[model samples]
Target: TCIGHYQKCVNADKPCCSKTVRYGDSKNVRKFICDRDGEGVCVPFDG
Candidate 1:
């Protein structure tokens, strides 16, 4: 199971996932939304 974890889309193009964190609702909440490019390089999912 990929529960309670986070991972880069490395080693394969298959999607990865992350479990819900203990961090409650609040401001300034940052997160990692892994993505790729023409060269399969990791990049930001937001502007």
Candidate 2:
């Protein structure tokens, strides 16, 4: 379930989500959305 949550976060363009997974601290992870500015502003799925 936690892994799924991480994936969902990435799909939503929330860099913080993937960061949490990489850090192995999803418990303290917070929700975040990508900002619109440049060409990659659509959503950071893997960034």
Candidate 3:
């Protein structure tokens, strides 16, 4: 998929950080930083 698809997914309440490619891939993996000052922010790795 493309960035547009990813944006849609993010807009659907799915955490942006939930999407990530493993090492050795050509795609620029997206990193989502929590904006709530670590209050209730969840990282993709939590899964």
lDDT per residue, candidate 1, 2-47, as tens digits?
Answer: 3122444665454433333365575342234545444442333322
RMSD of each: 5.1, 8.4, 7.5
Please provide TM-scores, in order, for all candidate models, with all chains considered together.
0.28, 0.19, 0.23
Q: In terms of TM-score, how similar is model 2 to the real structure?
A: 0.19
Runs with alpha carbons beyond 4 Å of true place in candidate 2? 1-27, 40-47
Question: Higher-lDDT candidate among 1 and 3?
Answer: 3
Q: Lowest summed-lDDT stretch of 10 residues in model 3?
A: 1-10
Give lDDT: candidate 2, residue 44: 29
> What does candidate 2's lDDT look like per residue over 1-47, in tens digits?
22223234324543344334445544443333444444333332443
Clashes of each: 0, 0, 0
Whole-model lDDT values for every prediction:
0.40, 0.37, 0.41
Q: What's the distance in Å from true for residue 29, model 3?
A: 0.5
The residue pairs found clashing in candidate 3 are none
